[PDB]
Amino acid sequence: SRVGDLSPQQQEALARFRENLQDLLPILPNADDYFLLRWLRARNFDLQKSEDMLRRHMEFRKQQDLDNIVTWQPPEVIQLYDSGGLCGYDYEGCPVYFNIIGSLDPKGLLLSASKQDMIRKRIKVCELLLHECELQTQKLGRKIEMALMVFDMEGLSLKHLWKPAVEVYQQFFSILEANYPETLKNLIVIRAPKLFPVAFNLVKSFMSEETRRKIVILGDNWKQELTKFISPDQLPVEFGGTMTDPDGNPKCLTKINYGGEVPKSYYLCEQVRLQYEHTRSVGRGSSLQVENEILFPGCVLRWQFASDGGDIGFGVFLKTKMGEQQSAREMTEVLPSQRYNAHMVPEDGSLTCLQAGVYVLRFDNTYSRMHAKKLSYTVEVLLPDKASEETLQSMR
Numbered sequence: 337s338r339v340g341d342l343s344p345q346q347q348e349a350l351a352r353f354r355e356n357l358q359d360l361l362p363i364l365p366n367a368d369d370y371f372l373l374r375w376l377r378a379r380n381f382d383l384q385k386s387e388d389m390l391r392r393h394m395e396f397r398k399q400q401d402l403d404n405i406v407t408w409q410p411p412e413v414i415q416l417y418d419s420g421g422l423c424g425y426d427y428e429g430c431p432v433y434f435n436i437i438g439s440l441d442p443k444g445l446l447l448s449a450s451k452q453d454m455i456r457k458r459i460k461v462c463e464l465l466l467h468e469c470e471l472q473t474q475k476l477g478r479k480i481e482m483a484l485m486v487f488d489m490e491g492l493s494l495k496h497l498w499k500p501a502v503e504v505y506q507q508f509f510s511i512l513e514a515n516y517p518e519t520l521k522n523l524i525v526i527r528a529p530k531l532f533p534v535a536f537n538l539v540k541s542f543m544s545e546e547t548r549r550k551i552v553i554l555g556d557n558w559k560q561e562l563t564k565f566i567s568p569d570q571l572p573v574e575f576g577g578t579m580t581d582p583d584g585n586p587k588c589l590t591k592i593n594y595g596g597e598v599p600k601s602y603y604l605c606e607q608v609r610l611q612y613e614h615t616r617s618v619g620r621g622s623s624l625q626v627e628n629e630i631l632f633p634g635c636v637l638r639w640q641f642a643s644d645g646g647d648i649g650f651g652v653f654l655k656t657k658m659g660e661q662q663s664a665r666e667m668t669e670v671l672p673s674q675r676y677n678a679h680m681v682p683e684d685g686s687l688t689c690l691q692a693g694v695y696v697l698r699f700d701n702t703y704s705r706m707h708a709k710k711l712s713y714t715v716e717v718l719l720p721d722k723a724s725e726e727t728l729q730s731m732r
């Protein structure tokens with residue numbers, strides 16, 4: 337349903353849509369048929385829903401001053417450590433953006449800056465890419481409508497699954513679908529480690545099916561495979577091409593930021609506000625066990641908790657028999673129990689399950705003979721996305 341071959345149904349729909357948007361035409365990012373058709377396709381030519389979607393976007397542009405975001409300067413920590421960059425063009429002339437996820441330190445960034453600034457940095461990238469598409473259109477004399485995004489997963493870690501960081505990427509993917517529909521040609525994933533299917537499963541429901549269908553996972557031969565999309569002379573040497581910085585650096589640091597660990601000197605806090613699924617009392621001299629059956633290795637357990645009334649002990653155990661509850665003496669110790677000041681600073685963490693069995697998170701108040709505790713917690717079993725898992729298996 338694109339420019340050129342619209343049906344009459346579609347051509348009449350487009351004309352009506354254009355008529356219904358007369359008030360907005362002078363302030364649209366572009367008032368051409370290409371622009372309008374993105375909103376129509378996103379809502380199957382339902383004139384009302386398409387209009388609602390576009391008008392919501394236009395309110396978002398006003399609220400966020402998006403026409404001027406290309407000159408917005410983020411906080412120093414985001415300028416220096418929030419990764420990614422625009423570099424090169426694909427064979428059609430679409431701009432390429434490198435998203436260096438694996439080297440990102442989103443925890444350090446969120447402890448040093450706001451979710452709002454991290455999201456605004458990512459919106460800025462969208463606007464920069466759109467401006468680059470327009471410049472390319474003018475230079476090439478034909479419409480360039482989309483960008484190509486490469487996602488470098490080298491370094492992806494349990495550390496990246498910190499719940500507040502994940503909420504950044506989830507919110508961003510929701511914003512992308514609502515405000516930048518059909519702006520990515522492909523989403524090319526390189527250097528995916530074993531953790532990728534679990535990580536991907538956390539964000540997949542926030543992207544549209546059309547976006548998901550454009551994901552391409554590359555294997556060991558990714559450098560050669562990338563050159564099917566992008567010319568070597570448009571690719572950094574780091575990613576298999578011939579482009580360098582003026583000083584010969586193969587990473588093209590003058591265009592692409594590679595993130596890295598945020599120095600502690602930038603931190604403005606060391607934990608953020610959390611929300612919890614459950615609240616329970618743990619009696620004086622007592623304990624609480626939260627059990628989860630893991631059916632295969634590679635599942636990830638992730639938790640967060642706070643206490644009131646004093647500290648709490650916490651460890652992770654693995655049952656040696658299924659059936660009745662076992663004591664800490666009888667179970668295998670997976671993560672040694674320790675006391676945490678979870679009444680002062682909430683705790684969180686994760687681990688990879690190396691075996692199938694019943695994993696038990698044990699909250700220990702047995703040492704506190706006079707004082708009970710109130711405990712709030714969330715404990716989640718994170719499963720792999722099955723398609724991603726199969727694909728990674730299939731690439732050896």
Ligand SMILES: CCCCCCCCCCC(=O)O
Binds near residue numbers: 496525536
């Ligand atoms: C093309 C799909 C990219 C998958 C990104 C999943 C990474 C989860 C980590 C969230 C974060 O730390 O920003």
